[PDB]
Protein backbone atom coordinates (compact mmCIF):
# COMPACT_ATOMS: atom_id res chain seq x y z
CA UNK A 1 0.00 0.00 0.00
CA UNK A 2 1.93 3.04 -1.37
CA UNK A 3 0.00 6.20 -0.31
CA UNK A 4 -1.63 8.46 -2.92
CA UNK A 5 0.72 11.03 -4.46
CA UNK A 6 0.13 14.56 -3.16
CA UNK A 7 -2.64 16.34 -5.13
CA UNK A 8 -0.12 18.76 -6.58
CA UNK A 9 3.41 17.49 -7.09
CA UNK A 10 6.04 18.99 -4.68
CA UNK A 11 8.74 18.32 -7.26
CA UNK A 12 7.83 21.07 -9.72
CA UNK A 13 10.26 23.94 -10.46
CA UNK A 14 7.97 26.20 -12.54
CA UNK A 15 9.36 28.10 -15.49
CA UNK A 16 12.09 26.41 -17.58
CA UNK A 17 14.59 27.31 -20.21
CA UNK A 18 13.76 25.70 -23.60
CA UNK A 19 15.94 25.77 -26.73
CA UNK A 20 16.08 23.85 -30.00
CA UNK A 21 19.51 24.45 -31.45
CA UNK A 22 21.66 21.68 -29.98
CA UNK A 23 21.90 18.03 -31.05
CA UNK A 24 20.00 15.46 -29.03
CA UNK A 25 21.14 11.93 -28.34
CA UNK A 26 18.36 9.59 -27.26
CA UNK A 27 20.79 7.06 -25.83
CA UNK A 28 21.99 9.88 -23.62
CA UNK A 29 18.41 10.98 -22.86
CA UNK A 30 17.67 7.38 -21.86
CA UNK A 31 20.66 7.45 -19.48
CA UNK A 32 19.52 10.81 -18.05
CA UNK A 33 16.09 9.23 -17.47
CA UNK A 34 16.99 5.91 -15.91
CA UNK A 35 13.54 5.44 -14.43
CA UNK A 36 11.68 5.50 -17.76
CA UNK A 37 10.98 1.84 -18.65
CA UNK A 38 10.92 0.17 -22.03
CA UNK A 39 8.35 1.76 -24.36
CA UNK A 40 8.50 5.05 -22.40
CA UNK A 41 6.56 4.00 -19.32
CA UNK A 42 6.97 5.53 -15.89
CA UNK A 43 5.11 5.60 -12.63
CA UNK A 44 6.41 7.00 -9.34
CA UNK A 45 8.23 4.64 -6.98
CA UNK A 46 6.98 6.35 -3.78
CA UNK A 47 3.27 6.91 -4.24
CA UNK A 48 0.34 5.96 -6.52
CA UNK A 49 -0.73 8.54 -9.08
CA UNK A 50 -4.49 8.85 -9.85
CA UNK A 51 -3.29 10.05 -13.25
CA UNK A 52 -2.97 7.12 -15.72
CA UNK A 53 -2.03 8.99 -18.76
CA UNK A 54 -1.35 7.84 -22.30
CA UNK A 55 0.37 10.61 -24.28
CA UNK A 56 -0.44 10.39 -27.92
CA UNK A 57 1.61 12.02 -30.63
CA UNK A 58 0.53 12.05 -34.29
CA UNK A 59 3.62 11.63 -36.41
CA UNK A 60 5.26 11.25 -39.78
CA UNK A 61 8.85 12.26 -40.72
CA UNK A 62 9.55 14.43 -37.67
CA UNK A 63 12.30 12.50 -35.93
CA UNK A 64 14.33 15.57 -35.06
CA UNK A 65 11.33 17.27 -33.39
CA UNK A 66 10.53 14.04 -31.54
CA UNK A 67 13.96 13.87 -29.88
CA UNK A 68 13.51 17.42 -28.54
CA UNK A 69 10.02 16.43 -27.36
CA UNK A 70 11.34 13.42 -25.54
CA UNK A 71 14.37 15.29 -24.11
CA UNK A 72 12.11 18.01 -22.59
CA UNK A 73 8.91 16.12 -21.67
CA UNK A 74 10.24 13.04 -20.02
CA UNK A 75 11.79 14.93 -17.07
CA UNK A 76 8.68 17.13 -16.75
CA UNK A 77 6.20 14.26 -16.82
CA UNK A 78 8.12 12.45 -14.06
CA UNK A 79 8.20 15.59 -11.89
CA UNK A 80 4.44 15.71 -12.32
CA UNK A 81 4.27 12.29 -10.66
CA UNK A 82 2.15 10.77 -13.48
CA UNK A 83 1.77 7.03 -14.30
CA UNK A 84 2.25 7.55 -18.01
CA UNK A 85 3.34 6.05 -21.36
CA UNK A 86 4.32 7.70 -24.60
CA UNK A 87 2.75 6.58 -27.96
CA UNK A 88 3.99 7.97 -31.29
CA UNK A 89 1.42 7.10 -33.94
CA UNK A 90 3.38 6.90 -37.12
CA UNK A 91 1.34 7.25 -40.36
CA UNK A 92 2.55 4.58 -42.85
CA UNK A 93 2.92 5.63 -46.46
CA UNK A 94 3.19 8.89 -48.35
CA UNK A 95 -0.37 10.03 -48.90
CA UNK A 96 -2.23 12.99 -47.30
CA UNK A 97 -1.71 13.26 -43.53
CA UNK A 98 -4.62 12.71 -41.09
CA UNK A 99 -3.84 14.04 -37.62
CA UNK A 100 -7.16 13.29 -35.89
CA UNK A 101 -7.47 9.74 -37.25
CA UNK A 102 -4.01 8.97 -35.92
CA UNK A 103 -5.06 10.35 -32.59
CA UNK A 104 -8.01 7.92 -32.55
CA UNK A 105 -5.70 4.98 -33.30
CA UNK A 106 -3.52 6.09 -30.41
CA UNK A 107 -6.47 6.08 -28.00
CA UNK A 108 -7.66 2.66 -29.11
CA UNK A 109 -4.17 1.01 -29.13
CA UNK A 110 -2.87 2.48 -25.87
CA UNK A 111 -5.89 1.00 -24.13
CA UNK A 112 -4.65 -2.43 -25.13
CA UNK A 113 -1.45 -1.88 -23.08
CA UNK A 114 -2.81 -0.68 -19.82
CA UNK A 115 -5.92 0.68 -18.03
CA UNK A 116 -5.26 4.36 -19.03
CA UNK A 117 -8.04 6.72 -17.95
CA UNK A 118 -6.52 9.99 -19.27
CA UNK A 119 -5.31 10.87 -22.74
CA UNK A 120 -3.06 13.70 -23.72
CA UNK A 121 -2.95 14.51 -27.42
CA UNK A 122 0.22 16.43 -28.19
CA UNK A 123 1.68 17.69 -31.40
CA UNK A 124 5.36 16.73 -31.59
CA UNK A 125 6.68 20.25 -31.95
CA UNK A 126 5.14 21.84 -28.80
CA UNK A 127 7.12 21.94 -25.58
CA UNK A 128 5.72 23.40 -22.39
CA UNK A 129 7.79 26.15 -20.67
CA UNK A 130 6.41 25.68 -17.21
CA UNK A 131 6.07 22.35 -15.39
CA UNK A 132 3.09 23.56 -13.47
CA UNK A 133 1.15 23.10 -16.77
CA UNK A 134 -0.31 19.68 -15.84
CA UNK A 135 -0.21 16.98 -18.56
CA UNK A 136 -3.22 15.08 -17.20
CA UNK A 137 -7.11 15.16 -17.18
CA UNK A 138 -9.53 17.45 -15.26
CA UNK A 139 -13.29 17.36 -14.68
CA UNK A 140 -13.69 19.15 -18.03
CA UNK A 141 -11.66 18.74 -21.28
CA UNK A 142 -8.27 20.48 -20.81
CA UNK A 143 -6.54 22.67 -23.29
CA UNK A 144 -2.82 22.69 -22.39
CA UNK A 145 -0.93 24.65 -25.03
CA UNK A 146 -2.70 27.93 -24.27
CA UNK A 147 0.05 30.60 -24.71
CA UNK A 148 2.19 29.55 -27.64
CA UNK A 149 5.05 31.78 -28.72
CA UNK A 150 4.00 31.57 -32.31
CA UNK A 151 0.63 33.14 -31.36
CA UNK A 152 2.26 35.86 -29.19
CA UNK A 153 1.95 33.91 -25.94
CA UNK A 154 -1.89 33.93 -25.98
CA UNK A 155 -4.71 32.01 -27.70
CA UNK A 156 -5.19 32.74 -31.40
CA UNK A 157 -8.94 32.71 -30.72
CA UNK A 158 -10.81 31.82 -27.53
CA UNK A 159 -12.29 28.62 -28.99
CA UNK A 160 -8.87 27.40 -30.10
CA UNK A 161 -8.33 23.83 -28.93
CA UNK A 162 -5.24 22.77 -31.02
CA UNK A 163 -1.74 21.82 -30.01
CA UNK A 164 -1.83 19.95 -26.82
CA UNK A 165 -4.95 18.89 -25.00
CA UNK A 166 -6.13 16.27 -22.50
CA UNK A 167 -9.41 14.35 -22.33
CA UNK A 168 -10.43 11.78 -19.78
CA UNK A 169 -11.42 8.36 -21.18
CA UNK A 170 -15.08 9.26 -20.41
CA UNK A 171 -14.88 12.67 -22.14
CA UNK A 172 -13.31 11.16 -25.28
CA UNK A 173 -15.95 8.34 -25.43
CA UNK A 174 -18.74 10.86 -24.86
CA UNK A 175 -17.87 12.74 -28.02
CA UNK A 176 -17.33 9.52 -30.10
CA UNK A 177 -13.65 10.45 -30.28
CA UNK A 178 -12.25 12.56 -32.98
CA UNK A 179 -13.41 12.87 -36.54
CA UNK A 180 -11.79 10.56 -39.16
CA UNK A 181 -12.28 12.58 -42.30
CA UNK A 182 -10.18 15.71 -41.88
CA UNK A 183 -7.41 14.93 -44.38
CA UNK A 184 -4.69 17.55 -44.69
CA UNK A 185 -4.18 20.58 -42.51
CA UNK A 186 -6.74 22.55 -40.57
CA UNK A 187 -10.09 22.35 -38.75
CA UNK A 188 -10.03 18.99 -36.98
CA UNK A 189 -9.27 20.69 -33.60
CA UNK A 190 -12.22 23.04 -34.16
CA UNK A 191 -14.40 20.06 -34.88
CA UNK A 192 -13.25 18.46 -31.67
CA UNK A 193 -14.03 21.72 -29.79
CA UNK A 194 -17.51 21.63 -31.42
CA UNK A 195 -17.97 18.05 -30.23
CA UNK A 196 -17.18 18.84 -26.61
CA UNK A 197 -19.55 21.87 -26.59
CA UNK A 198 -22.31 19.74 -28.26
CA UNK A 199 -21.97 17.27 -25.43
CA UNK A 200 -22.35 19.82 -22.61
CA UNK A 201 -18.68 20.39 -21.71
CA UNK A 202 -16.52 23.48 -21.54
CA UNK A 203 -12.75 23.93 -21.97
CA UNK A 204 -10.60 24.15 -18.79
CA UNK A 205 -7.15 25.86 -19.17
CA UNK A 206 -4.18 26.87 -17.01
CA UNK A 207 -3.41 30.62 -16.94
CA UNK A 208 -1.40 32.26 -19.73
CA UNK A 209 1.84 32.26 -17.75
CA UNK A 210 1.76 28.65 -16.63
CA UNK A 211 0.56 27.71 -20.18
CA UNK A 212 3.44 29.33 -22.07
CA UNK A 213 4.51 26.88 -24.77
CA UNK A 214 7.21 26.80 -27.40
CA UNK A 215 6.70 25.70 -30.98
CA UNK A 216 9.71 24.34 -32.92
CA UNK A 217 9.90 26.50 -36.06
CA UNK A 218 9.85 24.35 -39.20
CA UNK A 219 8.86 24.69 -42.83
CA UNK A 220 5.71 23.27 -44.34
CA UNK A 221 5.18 19.50 -44.44
CA UNK A 222 4.57 17.99 -47.87
CA UNK A 223 1.34 15.90 -47.98
CA UNK A 224 -0.49 18.00 -45.34
CA UNK A 225 -1.80 20.84 -47.51
CA UNK A 226 -4.68 22.96 -46.18
CA UNK A 227 -7.97 21.05 -46.43
CA UNK A 228 -10.33 23.13 -48.65
CA UNK A 229 -13.40 21.35 -47.24
CA UNK A 230 -12.49 22.24 -43.61
CA UNK A 231 -14.85 25.22 -43.23
CA UNK A 232 -17.82 23.15 -44.51
CA UNK A 233 -16.83 20.26 -42.28
CA UNK A 234 -16.66 22.18 -38.98
CA UNK A 235 -20.10 23.67 -39.70
CA UNK A 236 -21.73 20.19 -39.59
CA UNK A 237 -20.05 18.56 -36.59
CA UNK A 238 -23.19 18.17 -34.54
CA UNK A 239 -24.72 15.89 -37.13
CA UNK A 240 -21.53 14.18 -38.45
CA UNK A 241 -20.15 13.36 -34.97
CA UNK A 242 -22.94 10.90 -34.35
CA UNK A 243 -21.55 8.40 -36.86
CA UNK A 244 -17.99 9.65 -37.67
CA UNK A 245 -15.35 8.79 -35.04
CA UNK A 246 -14.56 5.93 -32.81
CA UNK A 247 -17.71 4.13 -33.98
CA UNK A 248 -16.62 4.35 -37.70
CA UNK A 249 -12.85 3.77 -37.16
CA UNK A 250 -10.78 1.06 -38.87
CA UNK A 251 -6.99 0.87 -39.52
CA UNK A 252 -4.25 -1.73 -39.83
CA UNK A 253 -1.25 -1.60 -37.48
CA UNK A 254 1.86 -2.53 -39.52
CA UNK A 255 4.41 -2.49 -36.70
CA UNK A 256 4.76 -1.75 -32.96
CA UNK A 257 8.31 -0.85 -31.72
CA UNK A 258 9.05 -0.56 -28.00
CA UNK A 259 11.93 1.90 -27.87
CA UNK A 260 13.39 2.83 -24.50
CA UNK A 261 11.64 6.27 -24.37
CA UNK A 262 8.51 5.54 -26.47
CA UNK A 263 6.25 3.05 -28.18
CA UNK A 264 5.92 3.71 -31.90
CA UNK A 265 2.82 2.33 -33.61
CA UNK A 266 3.19 2.36 -37.33
CA UNK A 267 -0.23 2.36 -38.90
CA UNK A 268 -1.99 2.32 -42.26
CA UNK A 269 -5.01 4.69 -41.96
CA UNK A 270 -5.89 4.73 -45.66
CA UNK A 271 -6.88 7.60 -47.90
CA UNK A 272 -10.23 9.49 -48.25
CA UNK A 273 -13.32 7.39 -48.79
C1 LIG B 1 -10.79 25.72 -39.77
C2 LIG B 1 -9.31 25.95 -39.58
O3 LIG B 1 -8.55 26.13 -40.53
N4 LIG B 1 -8.89 25.92 -38.32
C5 LIG B 1 -7.48 26.17 -37.97
C6 LIG B 1 -7.14 27.63 -37.74
O7 LIG B 1 -7.28 28.31 -38.98
C8 LIG B 1 -7.29 29.70 -38.81
C9 LIG B 1 -6.72 30.28 -40.09
O10 LIG B 1 -5.39 29.87 -40.17
C11 LIG B 1 -4.69 30.54 -41.21
O12 LIG B 1 -3.36 30.01 -41.31
C13 LIG B 1 -2.44 30.52 -40.35
C14 LIG B 1 -2.22 29.45 -39.28
O15 LIG B 1 -3.41 29.14 -38.50
C16 LIG B 1 -1.05 29.84 -38.39
O17 LIG B 1 -0.67 28.79 -37.54
C18 LIG B 1 0.18 30.11 -39.27
O19 LIG B 1 1.19 30.59 -38.40
O20 LIG B 1 -0.06 31.10 -40.24
C21 LIG B 1 -1.12 30.84 -41.11
C22 LIG B 1 -1.14 32.13 -41.94
O23 LIG B 1 -1.83 33.06 -41.14
C24 LIG B 1 -5.39 30.35 -42.56
O25 LIG B 1 -4.78 31.12 -43.56
C26 LIG B 1 -6.89 30.68 -42.54
O27 LIG B 1 -7.45 30.23 -43.77
C28 LIG B 1 -8.31 31.18 -44.41
O29 LIG B 1 -9.51 31.36 -43.69
C30 LIG B 1 -10.45 32.25 -44.29
C31 LIG B 1 -11.73 32.31 -43.49
O32 LIG B 1 -11.38 32.57 -42.15
C33 LIG B 1 -10.84 31.77 -45.68
O34 LIG B 1 -11.74 32.70 -46.25
C35 LIG B 1 -9.60 31.57 -46.55
O36 LIG B 1 -10.01 30.92 -47.72
C37 LIG B 1 -8.55 30.71 -45.85
N38 LIG B 1 -7.32 30.85 -46.60
C39 LIG B 1 -6.45 29.91 -46.96
C40 LIG B 1 -5.29 30.49 -47.73
O41 LIG B 1 -6.52 28.68 -46.74
C42 LIG B 1 -7.50 29.91 -41.37
O43 LIG B 1 -7.43 28.50 -41.60
O44 LIG B 1 -5.83 27.84 -37.25
C45 LIG B 1 -5.58 27.15 -36.04
C46 LIG B 1 -4.24 27.68 -35.52
O47 LIG B 1 -3.14 27.36 -36.39
C48 LIG B 1 -5.57 25.66 -36.42
O49 LIG B 1 -5.25 24.93 -35.25
C50 LIG B 1 -7.02 25.30 -36.83
O51 LIG B 1 -7.11 23.96 -37.32
O1 LIG C 1 3.97 15.61 -42.05
C2 LIG C 1 3.53 15.78 -40.92
C3 LIG C 1 2.45 16.66 -40.64
C4 LIG C 1 2.17 16.88 -39.26
N5 LIG C 1 2.67 16.02 -38.26
C6 LIG C 1 2.19 16.06 -36.83
O7 LIG C 1 0.95 16.77 -36.74
C8 LIG C 1 1.10 17.97 -35.99
C9 LIG C 1 0.34 19.13 -36.66
O10 LIG C 1 0.88 19.74 -37.81
P11 LIG C 1 1.62 21.23 -37.85
O12 LIG C 1 1.00 22.18 -36.88
O13 LIG C 1 3.05 21.11 -37.47
O14 LIG C 1 1.51 21.86 -39.36
P15 LIG C 1 2.09 23.31 -39.87
O16 LIG C 1 2.67 24.06 -38.71
O17 LIG C 1 3.10 23.16 -40.97
O18 LIG C 1 0.98 24.14 -40.44
C19 LIG C 1 2.62 18.13 -35.90
O20 LIG C 1 3.07 18.92 -34.83
C21 LIG C 1 3.13 16.70 -35.81
O22 LIG C 1 2.93 16.08 -34.54
C23 LIG C 1 3.72 15.16 -38.56
O24 LIG C 1 4.28 14.51 -37.64
N25 LIG C 1 4.16 15.08 -39.90
MN1 LIG D 1 4.02 22.85 -36.24
Q: What are the φ and ψ backbone dihedral angles of 74, each rounded to 5 degrees?
A: -60, -45
Is ligand 1 within 6 A of the CB of residue 234?
Answer: yes
Residue 128 is part of which domain span?
A: 1-273
19: three-class secondary structure by DSSP: coil
Is ligand 2 within 6 A of the CB of residue 125?
Answer: yes
By CB neighbour count within 10 A (0-12 exposed, 13-18 middle, 19+ buried), where does 34 fall? exposed
Domain of 256, CATH number, reads: 3.90.550.10
Strand partners, 204: 142
Solved using: X-ray
Query: What resolution in angstroms, rounded to 1 decimal?
Result: 2.0
DSSP annotation string for 30-62: HHH-TTPBTTTEE--SSSB-S-EEEEEEEESS-
Instruction: Report how far ligand 3's centroid is from the alpha carbon of 67 (Å).
Output: 15
- Start-to-end C-alpha separation, the chain: 51
95: three-class secondary structure by DSSP: coil
- 13: nearest Cα among 163, 108, 130, 126: 130
For ligand 2, atom 18, the nearest C-alpha belongs to 220
- Give the number of whichever ligand sits closest to the CA of residue 231: 1
| Site to substitute for ligand 1 among 182, 186, 229, most atoms within 8 A of C-beta | 186
149 is known to lie in a ligand binding site: no
DSSP annotation string for 190-233: HHHHHHHHHTT---B---TTTTEEEE----PPTT--B-TTHHHH
Strands (E), 100-176: 118-122, 126-128, 142-143, 147-148, 164-168
- 272: nearest Cα among 247, 246, 244, 253: 244
The number of domains in the chain is: 1
Atom of ligand 2 nearest to the CA of 126: 20
- Give the number of whichever ligand sits closest to the CA of residue 220: 2
Distance between CA 238 and CA 1 in Å, rounded? 45
28: three-class secondary structure by DSSP: helix
Distance between CA 203 and CA 165 in Å, rounded? 10
Amino acid sequence: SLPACPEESPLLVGPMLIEFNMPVDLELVAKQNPNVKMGGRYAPRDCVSPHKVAIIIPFRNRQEHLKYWLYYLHPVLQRQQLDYGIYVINQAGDTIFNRAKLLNVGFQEALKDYDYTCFVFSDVDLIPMNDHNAYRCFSQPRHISVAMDKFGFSLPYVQYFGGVSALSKQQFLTINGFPNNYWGWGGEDDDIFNRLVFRGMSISRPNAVVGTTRHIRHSRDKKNEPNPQRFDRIAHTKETMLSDGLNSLTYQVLDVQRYPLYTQITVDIGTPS
